[PDB]
Amino acid sequence: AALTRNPQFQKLQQWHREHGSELNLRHLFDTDKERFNHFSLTLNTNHGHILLDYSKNLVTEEVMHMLLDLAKSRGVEAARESMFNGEKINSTEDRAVLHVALRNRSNTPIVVDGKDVMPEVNKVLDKMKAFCQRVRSGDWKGYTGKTITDVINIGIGGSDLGPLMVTEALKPYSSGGPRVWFVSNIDGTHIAKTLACLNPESSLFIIASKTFTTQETITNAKTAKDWFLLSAKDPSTVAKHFVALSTNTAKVKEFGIDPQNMFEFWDWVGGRYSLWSAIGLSIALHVGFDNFEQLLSGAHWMDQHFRTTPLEKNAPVLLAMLGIWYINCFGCETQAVLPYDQYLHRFAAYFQQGDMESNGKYITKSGARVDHQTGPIVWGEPGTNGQHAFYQLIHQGTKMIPCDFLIPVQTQHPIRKGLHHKILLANFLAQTEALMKGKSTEEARKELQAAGKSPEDLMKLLPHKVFEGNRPTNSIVFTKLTPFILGALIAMYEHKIFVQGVVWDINSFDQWGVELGKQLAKKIEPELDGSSPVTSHDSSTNGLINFIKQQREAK
Amino acid sequence: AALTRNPQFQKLQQWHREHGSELNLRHLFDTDKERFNHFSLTLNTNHGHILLDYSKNLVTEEVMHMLLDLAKSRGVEAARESMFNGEKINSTEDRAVLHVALRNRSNTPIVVDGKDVMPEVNKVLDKMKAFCQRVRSGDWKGYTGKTITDVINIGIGGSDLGPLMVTEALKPYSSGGPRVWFVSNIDGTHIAKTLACLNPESSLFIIASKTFTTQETITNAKTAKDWFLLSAKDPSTVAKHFVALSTNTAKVKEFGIDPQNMFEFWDWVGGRYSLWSAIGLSIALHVGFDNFEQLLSGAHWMDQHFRTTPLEKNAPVLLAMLGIWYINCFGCETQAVLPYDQYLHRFAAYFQQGDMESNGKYITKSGARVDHQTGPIVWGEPGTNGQHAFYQLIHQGTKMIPCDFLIPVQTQHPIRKGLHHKILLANFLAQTEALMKGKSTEEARKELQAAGKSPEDLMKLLPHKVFEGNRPTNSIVFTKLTPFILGALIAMYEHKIFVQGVVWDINSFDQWGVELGKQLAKKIEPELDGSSPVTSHDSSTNGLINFIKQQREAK
Ligand SMILES: O=C(O)[C@@H](O)[C@H](O)[C@H](O)COP(=O)(O)O
Ligand SMILES: O=C(O)[C@@H](O)[C@H](O)[C@H](O)COP(=O)(O)O
């Protein structure tokens, strides 16, 4: 792999094996009153400020220099320009990677195969707004004349999680916007419980599928139409209750959807980076197009920051290299994302896909097997809830877990004159401080010495109440969680993922494991029918199939 | 630490060092036709069957034997008996650990401090039933004479996640029950968006708090009460709209709730193991007491199985030891929980708390610091969705990730004549099969050749489409996800967590990190008031606070 033989990488590993374990956060702060000033980054977007405080990390000026040197020796900047210019960096599928073009508000041309893609990008956007306007104003009528009250997005993976996470995060910006629903799982329970609360006459279905062949989505779409053609009767009506977001016109029309009701995107739009395209139609419908453009504008601002800022002060690059440090040097398997915001309850899950599906690879772009770790397992839940649960292991477990704490300064609901948000902010701050500082045996002893216990009882309990600390965290604070700021935050992590993939020299934009998945079920599906036992697979698969057949009708 | 000094552990460790990396699933199944039969366990509960297929694990008869020898020499059985008999095994807080008493349907006596605890357990249950009957039947009236249409649980951590996850999992059994809401985060958004959809006259609040002092819960409770009184005006009406689940009679009275409206539990009821107690009131209100008793009965059945079954055929013990194998021998940091069931969408999150908060420890019961790994990071999302996202990393990443795949044979929504469930089952089966088998270079090469790829195209794509497989999984299949089966499944994992805790010799029932967290914020809260900069903390904490103060004014 290109990595382990890289001089800057070897230098970093050499340094870590000699000083890595010695680094102590509490000691670093107690010996450098300027640590925060030197290890933090403030970004004025003109639409709110974003503070990236990466000072509670196990790094020194020297470490950061070695990390930035590695990013440079690995060609991060050149790779970046290649993506922004529309080059087919997605080598395995021979495609460009242009989610950045989807939000290119500057409209600077980006040529992909002879012609600029911006014109078609803006055309779909205009088509989206036009359609969105008709639905919102009550202009677009249902087959019996009523206005649409519910919009149901049907899709899975990249055609589901982005719009879901964003609509959830931007709920405060949904007006005369119809209710939005997200059906994704093939599990019948999903569409069933969703359709049970809907009126066919005022429900609009959005079939989101890049390829338009995914079994879960097409099956759910067909079931939804049957449920519709049910109370409706007559297939000419569908045209007023079903629209599509895809890149395959034939398949769409083949399903029964007119060309005018298809909002397309392109192959250079990865599912996990598609909410910025037609896929985000449910977002626009929910919060309006002005807010959707703000979302796009926020990402564009971050794209520019990432493209024009010196690596040393580049947000996504810093986040990426700190990750490299923990992954490749400390060997941390995971990365926690902890938003202190209820609206962002699907945020960690969104990047669990975005990150893991992008960098969960073991083959370099040249085809060589990596001999180092790649993408981490991303996970998390919004705080303060986690502080009462899994933070126990973060504080006193045997695993090093880098954590990104995020929070907006201003809340969308300043109830009780801000009492709730004040407490939320206090916990946000106190937790990272405690993870860094911990509580020594002596501090715990003195505290217990005041309990009136005694050397017998103080003794049995003391070690259990000691916190070794030295748990690294990043604190990301922003003025307010608005459509613009959310867009910037998402783009920030998209680029963090990009930078790491470059360092590891893998293809962060293909997903052969996901493609594999869409073909695996076909063989087993027909074998499930009937009570006759199956013996064509390994004994476990056979045994499970036979248990299923046996229990299928059990009362 | 006791583990590393254990003879059976060293033997296991030695064996792993000399052959561990040689184990290959595909080869193990290819050479053994009886593998499934030899590495699977069927449980007939008389209320559905549960098949635990652990054959797709990197183990042989010899490994399982060594693992079981370890469970025995680490005293699992004696520890189990100590828990069931009411001994105060929670050494640090000097408390018993009796969630098993909460669901002890057999009513066999459990002496705790000379007094059988069952009479009190059953008294609260009867009280819970009488109350829920009044509420559900409409007997219980609001301050204006209306029946209760919405029940709102206010609590956090152990006083929130269990009831939330169970009510979600058992939605099909909620007919005739009022709508249930869960408010937990201190973040004002949570209660504000909840109260916005409620009518004070028909809303009943349940304040769930073992201590009744947790800041998030009490603050949320006070906000709800203020909201309520804004309409009811008369504070004497609170008695008809507020009840409490707690162990602190004094604080409950202090809040303003009368004794007869307090459903109690005890100190030996850990929050993360409390849904079986009064904390489960919202569950009973949602699905009825018969269903709630079935839930308890399922757990009781699993408790008996765990207590009376020889280790070798003991479900929780097997799951626990397989985990020890991956954690202490293979060094895997995480454990994925993947339920192929939309109703179980919060199941993984529930055990993320139950497992991590229990075993995320680094101090043994003797006070020694562990010199080995303890609890893993637990995570996951329902299937099939994950297949289109993070499964990419599980299939082609650089991390070994044990996965538990769960699914009910019979669905609660057999729509389309069972088509949706058929596909779900096929995916469940094919995924574990592929994780095990993978796809060699030869197999991938043949496919590319069959697809008509040129030597060039095939050469450049080939490596990227290869799957090394050998990814271990457990497949847990049950007849149907009923209240009883859900209860058995939860209790099963509760005991897996218990067994591992005994092997590691840690206290799986305290949570000093969680206790610490509930006091950390108090110092910073008052410091946020005002515009003057703070300098009483480390430079990072100081800088963040000052950024917050500066941006508090930004418009
Ligand atoms: O990330 C991917 O590439 C997958 O999650 C896809 O988004 C998901 O399978 C949907 O594919 P499609 O939009 O073609 O239906
Ligand atoms: O697991 C725990 O012990 C915590 O998550 C508690 O459940 C949570 O802090 C609520 O504590 P209480 O019920 O006393 O309000």
What secondary structure, in 3-state letters, does B174-190 show? CCCCCEEEEECCCCHHH
B26 membership: H or E segment, kind and range: helix B25-31
- Cα-Cα-Cα-Cα dihedral sign, residues A370, A373, A377, A378: negative
Distance of CA B515 to the CA centre of its chain: 19
Q: Are B165 and B346 in contact (CB under 8 A)?
A: yes
Q: Does A218 touch chain B (CB under 8 A)?
A: no
A437 is in an annotated binding site: no
Would you call A19 helix, strand, or coil by DSSP?
helix
Distance of CA A532 to the CA centre of its chain: 43
Would you call B282 helix, strand, or coil by DSSP?
helix
Distance CA B123, CA B120 (A): 5
* Residue B158 Cβ contacting ligand 2 at under 6 Å: yes
> Tokens 């040529």 appear where?
A111
Preceding omega of B384 cis (within 30 degrees of 0): yes
Q: Are residues A428 and A543 in the same domain?
A: no
Distance CA A356, CA A339 (A): 19
Q: Are residues B500 and B366 in the same domain?
A: yes
Dihedral (Cα; B427, B430, B436, B437), 10-degree rounding? -140
Angle between helices A483-504 and A76-84 (to 10 degrees): 130
Nearest by CB: A157 against B214, B385, B460: B385
Q: Do B430 and A524 touch (CB under 8 A)?
A: yes
Angle between helices A188-195 and B419-437 (to 10 degrees): 150
Amino acid (1-letter code) at residue A497: I
Give per-residue burial for A71-80: e unless 16+ CB within 10 Å, then b.
beebebbebb
Distance CA A99, CA A91 (A): 16
> And the tokens for B170?
């058992």
How many CB atoms are located within 10 Å of the residue A193 CB? 16
- Cα-Cα-Cα-Cα dihedral sign, residues A146, A148, A149, A155: positive
Q: Are B57 and B67 in contact (CB under 8 A)?
A: no
Our mutation pick for probing the ligand 1 site, out of A214, A511, A516, counting the most ligand atoms within 8 A of Cβ, is A214
Active-site entry in A127, A518, A537, A549: A518
Cα end-to-end span (Å), chain B: 56
Our mutation pick for probing the ligand 2 site, out of B207, B216, B514, B516, counting the most ligand atoms within 8 A of Cβ, is B514
What stretches of B360-482 show up as alpha helix (H) in DSSP? 391-396, 419-437, 441-450, 455-461
> Tokens 């020898």 appear where?
B69
Could you tell me the resolution of this structure in angstroms? Answer: 1.9
Residues pairing with B50 in the sheet = B43, B478
Distance CA A265, CA A403 (A): 34
Q: Are residues A17 and A43 in the same domain?
A: yes
Q: Are residues B219 and B314 in the same domain?
A: no
Q: Are residues B227 and B357 in the same domain?
A: no
Distance CA A432, CA A386 (A): 13
A144 is in an annotated binding site: no
Distance CA B156, CA A373 (A): 36
Q: Does B34 touch chain A (CB under 8 A)?
A: yes
Active-site entry in A33, A388, A522, A555: A388
Q: Are B263 and B245 in contact (CB under 8 A)?
A: yes
Q: Are A46 and A97 in contact (CB under 8 A)?
A: no
> And the tokens for B354?
């139950």
Q: Does B115 touch chain A (CB under 8 A)?
A: no
* Residue A184 Cβ contacting ligand 1 at under 6 Å: no
Would you call A89 helix, strand, or coil by DSSP?
coil
Preceding omega of A384 cis (within 30 degrees of 0): yes
Considering every ligand atom shown, identify the ligand nearest to the alpha carbon of residue B252 and give its number: 2
How many CB atoms are located within 10 Å of the residue A459 CB? 13
Instruction: Give the DSSP letter of residue A204.
Output: E
Distance CA A347, CA A344 (A): 5
Distance CA B391, CA B383 (A): 10
Atom of ligand 2 nearest to the CA of B208: 13
Amino acid (1-letter code) at residue A326: Y
A208 membership: H or E segment, kind and range: strand A203-208
- CATH for A523: 1.10.1390.10
* A280 closest CA partner among A229, A222, A215, A208: A208
Distance CA A385, CA B186 (A): 8
> And the tokens for B514?
């969680």
Angle between helices B512-520 and A419-437 (to 10 degrees): 130
A207 membership: H or E segment, kind and range: strand A203-208
> Tokens 């939330």 appear where?
B164
Instruction: Give the DSSP letter of residue B506.
Output: B
Distance CA B68, CA B77 (A): 11
Q: Which of A233, A267, A293 is the last residue of a domain?
A: A293
Q: Are A191 and A183 in contact (CB under 8 A)?
A: yes
Question: What are the CA-CA distances from residue B68 to residues A286, B204, B499 (Å)?
Answer: 56, 50, 11
Q: Are residues A372 and A461 in the same domain?
A: yes
How many CB atoms are located within 10 Å of the residue B69 CB? 18
| Residues of chain B contacting A359 with CB distance shorter than 8 Å | 393, 397
Q: Which domain holds residue A540?
A: 515-555
Dihedral (Cα; A527, A533, A537, A543), 10-degree rounding? 120
Q: Are residues A125 and A246 in the same domain?
A: yes
Q: Are B480 and B409 in contact (CB under 8 A)?
A: yes
Distance (Å) from the C-alpha of residue A196 to the closest C-alpha of chain B? 12
Q: Are residues B243 and B301 in the same domain?
A: no
Question: What are the CA-CA distances from residue B298 to residues A181, B122, B217, B329, B412 (Å)?
Answer: 34, 17, 30, 33, 18
Q: Are A189 and B341 in contact (CB under 8 A)?
A: yes
Distance (Å) from the C-alpha of residue A520 to the closest C-alpha of chain B? 6
Percentages of chain A per state (helix, strand, coil), in multiples of 5: 55, 15, 35
Q: Under the phi-then-psi rule, with left for phi > 0, alpha for psi from -120 to 50, and beta for the rest, what region is A70?
A: alpha
* B283 closest CA partner among B170, B197, B130, B203: B170
Considering every ligand atom shown, identify the ligand nearest to the alpha carbon of residue B275 and give its number: 2
Question: What are the CA-CA distances from residue A112 to residues A84, A96, A123, A279 (Å)?
Answer: 11, 7, 17, 21
> And the tokens for A410?
């201003």
Q: Which of B271, B293, B315 is the last residue of a domain?
A: B293
Distance CA B488, CA A280 (A): 41
Distance CA A417, CA A412 (A): 12
Q: Are residues A533 and A427 in the same domain?
A: no
Q: Does A356 touch chain B (CB under 8 A)?
A: yes
> And the tokens for A311?
């690596």
Angle between helices B289-308 and B483-504 (to 10 degrees): 40
Distance CA B223, CA B242 (A): 12
Would you call A11 helix, strand, or coil by DSSP?
helix
> And the tokens for B402?
């044990």
Q: Are residues A94 and A106 in the same domain?
A: no
Dihedral (Cα; B116, B119, B120, B124), 10-degree rounding? 150
> And the tokens for A411?
């809340």
Distance CA A95, CA B364 (A): 54
Amino acid (1-letter code) at residue B123: K
Q: Are A470 and A464 in contact (CB under 8 A)?
A: no
- Cα-Cα-Cα-Cα dihedral sign, residues A325, A328, A330, A331: positive
Complete edge-to-edge strand list for the sheet that includes strand B150-154: B179-183, B150-154, B203-208, B242-246, B262-264
Residues pairing with B207 in the sheet = B154, B244
Give nearest CA residue, ligand 2 atom 7: B158
Q: Are A484 and A490 in contact (CB under 8 A)?
A: no
Distance CA B497, CA A52 (A): 37
Q: Which of B274, B293, B312 is the last residue of a domain?
A: B293
- CATH for A280: 3.40.50.10490
A212 is in an annotated binding site: yes
How many CB atoms are located within 10 Å of the residue A16 CB? 18
Q: Are residues A519 and A492 in the same domain?
A: no
Distance CA A195, CA A152 (A): 9
List the single residue in B with minimal CA-CA distance to A469. Answer: B513
Residues 41-80 of A with CB under 8 A from B: 42, 48-49, 51, 53, 55-56
For residue B233, give every residue at least 6 positions away whose Cβ sits within 8 Å of its Cβ, in sequence order, or none.
none
- Radius of gyration over every alpha carbon of chain B, rounded to an integer in angstroms: 26
Nearest by CB: A391 against B49, B92, B514: B514
Q: Are residues B408 and B465 in the same domain?
A: yes
- CA triple A86-A87-A88, angle to 5 deg: 115
Amino acid (1-letter code) at residue B46: N
Distance CA A42, CA A45 (A): 10
Give nearest CA residue, ligand 1 atom 15: A209
Tell me phi and psi for residue B343, to 5 degrees. -65, -30
* Count of domains for chain A: 3
Distance (Å) from the C-alpha of residue A515 to the closest C-alpha of chain B? 8
B51 membership: H or E segment, kind and range: strand B49-53
Is residue B421 flagged as an active site residue? no
Q: Are A497 and A354 in contact (CB under 8 A)?
A: yes
